[model samples]
Target: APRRCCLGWDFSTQQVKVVAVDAELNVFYEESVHFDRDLPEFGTQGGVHVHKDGLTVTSPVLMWVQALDIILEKMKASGFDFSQVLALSGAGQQHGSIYWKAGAQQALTSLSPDLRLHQQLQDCFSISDCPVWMDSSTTAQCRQLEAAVGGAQALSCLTGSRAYERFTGNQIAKIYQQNPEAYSHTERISLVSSFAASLFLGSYSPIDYSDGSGMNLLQIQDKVWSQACLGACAPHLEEKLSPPVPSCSVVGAISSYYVQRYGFPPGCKVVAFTGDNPASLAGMRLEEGDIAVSLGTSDTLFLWLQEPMPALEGHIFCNPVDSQHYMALLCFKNGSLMREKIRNESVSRSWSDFSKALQSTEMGNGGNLGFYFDVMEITPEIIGRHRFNTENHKVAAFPGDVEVRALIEGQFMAKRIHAEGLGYRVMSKTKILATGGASHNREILQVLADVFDAPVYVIDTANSACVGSAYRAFHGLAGGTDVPFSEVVKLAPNPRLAATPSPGASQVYEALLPQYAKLEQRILSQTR
Candidate 1:
């Protein structure tokens, strides 16, 4: 009589969260196990260890495994039926990785139901404190990696991103260089995402295309480990990484450990896992023509691309839903931070008034747009403020209301321009999905819709990765068919429509973008 469901797990930075999604794709149950609070014995702060160097960050891998055991037991205690779960998948913190010792695969496949995951695998890890994405300790390794693969642009073209410090490749390089003994004895390197999947699988899980793309070692175009990048990172690196699988690939059946220990059906499938960003896209059901705007103090954008343009800026990864497609990620440093600055001065720091301003202003802001960067903005290395008028002439100031509208307009304009720079095109079916603190403001979302010339939709937005993993598990149920991911999750809750482009809003912004780009260039020139 139990409801049939799928389990989606999130091995996030600080906690392990899981959501039980019914066959209709409704997320019906949720639970979490926090490292800092629940597992205080690990002595972790924010679930990580900040080493003496300040930039080197790591987490105990066994803590993650134990956290999983806790979550499963909690579900059991609540009378949750594990046997009702048709399949399971998960998301991991994007670039955190785990190192398994030689012969660890044997230990993984043969887990004993009599013992918990952490107890049996205590000695499995070669590095107890494995590197997570927060670590920025690989500047030297990053440069060496770029040089080995020709340069930044070349590496970017090959790997879907420029060499970054938190990339698994660079982390591996740091480990191999400083701890050769450990590196030599290591058998496999699993991203935190795949490591969690491995626990359910009872064997090492193959890296998924979406998460693996974040590692500089994987060739984005070829879907293989870049030999040059491997040589640059560590010796015999290819052997250490089992071939990656597609994000939807069913890695294997649930481990007998789970079937015996927690009453999981032995036939329960284990779908491949991916990174949190991709998982969020899945949770929202972002389609090929959709763009996701996550508006925190630092705003992030996720675009679903049929074809990707690899550049020196922004990060690209394989599409989690469509293996043949790709995804682009762009971040802005001056997001909510700048908005807060404008709100404090313009509308007496009132978000309601801020929305009132956006509502009152003309859609195009009467040809007046401003670029306000209180802090350094990435994707563009420019800071400071520059305002322009209808004539595209530089202006010194604006009224308080105009400032609010202009800030919102200019921010969205910049997002559109940058997105187009990376080969993003707004299709007839394009949808803008907004999330984060600023997404709560209808006024902000109105500008987002107008600037992008699309209908805006809002997701409730908590535990997206966990829900997406559940969705991913659903997708795998189609197994070996050509059924598109979109068709499979059609029953999932739809994002609420927040706003739509004002009538003729498209025509106005169509003329505003080039000018915005011009003023943006104007700011960069004066600063540099």
Candidate 2:
């Protein structure tokens, strides 16, 4: 019988999510397993509070194991059987990658009992998780890498932007510079999420262009690694990199061991993967001019462009859904985390109380408090530290000290500034679509609409990355060369709500935005 379900997984910051869709893109099942509360709090230091450190979560091997376990648990909980699952694939956080020592791929062993191997492996293939794109830990490395690639101007002209810290290319360089021993023994470099799936399949493969492009190593027009850029980052390490695959292209099949351990069918295909942000765009079925703002710990602004555009002093290049298209994305280091931390510190309010505060806070009250909310400034420069800096970092803003409602409102204003800047670059004919952790926040969405002076749309689909991943998987399952991206997007359906811009609020925010920008600049100054 033809399979009825497609499994798509997204390894997002807070959870391992699985979304099941029917052939026509209608969602039939959705489940997500949040990271256990016990994990250490190692978010992007000096960056946005919404983003997490790669190491703070479970190991790639462990994250996949737990994710699969949860996927099965949710399937059973939802009264669905695994046998009914037809094809599957996934997307995850991009840039930060996982390295496996050589031969680790072939040395088949039970991950459950290999505690000692796991420990040794950590020593051999550790990640700094800085420049996490959400982090600015590697500004120096970015400069070094860009210089190696023939300087920032040349790189931007060729690759679309200067080197960034969280970009896979620069992060890898930092890894080698800081941990020479581990870099020397490395076997393969995989996107953090790809490595997770690789462990399940018992193989290593390259990521799709969308994810690879996030690394700054890919030349979109040619669909291969850029020789010029590779030399700029890590010359000796280029050979170990995996080849870029077209979106949803199958890289391997389920291994026998994974089948035995997870109860999945043996032939389930694992497709070439995408970065979570790119996948989110796919999940939303976005097209040219459509804007997607992911509100996780950090705010990710993704603007899809029909053609490649230069970083223009402070933007980053986004890999394409396919070779023919490109994404222009900007990451704002701070997202919901800043608001949550502020509430917890000051009002000592629970999440519900915080939500209430936002609900009660009216827009256009510009006199409360103004903030830039500089979490991780990845572009132009990166400064690593935890406190929210304003007035040139001379003023330390703590959530515990501010009025809980004002803090949340202040953050909303901050997002408005980020969105307007991003909007100017990509707002031609596309409608704006919002996703990520903050998508559910009504106040945040209202603020986004009002600030951008645009109508905001949301998809009905849950776990968008998984839906996107599965969309690609189904195409591969059918032996099709390309995934039906635009068609699959029909499944997200109409949003439950569409927020219109409040001109009153927009006018107020417009006036406030310049002040926020000035404040961001002052705080960003290193001397502060």
Each candidate: RMSD: 1.4, 7.4
Error of 2 at 246 (Å): 1.6
Q: Give the per-residue Cα lDDT of candidate 1 at 295.
A: 92
Cα displacement (Å) at residue 382, model 2: 12
The count of backbone overlaps in candidate 2 is: 17
- TM-score (C-alpha, index-matched) for candidate 2: 0.69
Per-residue CA lDDT of model 2 for 128-230, tens digit only, reads 3322344456678788777776777677656656676667787777777778787777777777557656754566666677777777787766778888777
Q: Can you give the TM-score per candidate against the true fold?
A: 0.97, 0.69
Residue-level lDDT of model 1, residues 1-528, one tens digit each, is: 568999999999899999999987788899999999999999999999999999999999999989998999999999998889899999999999899999998989889999999898989999999899899999999999998889999999898899989999999999999999999999999999999988888888899999999999888877999999999999998888888888989999999899999999988999999999899888988898889999997889999988788887788898899888899899899988799989998886689988888878888888888988888778688877888888888888988889998899988888888888778999999999999999899889988998888999998778999999998898898753368888998888888999998889878987878878988887888887
Which candidate gets the maximum lDDT versus the true structure?
A: 1
Q: In TM-score terms, which candidate is top?
A: 1
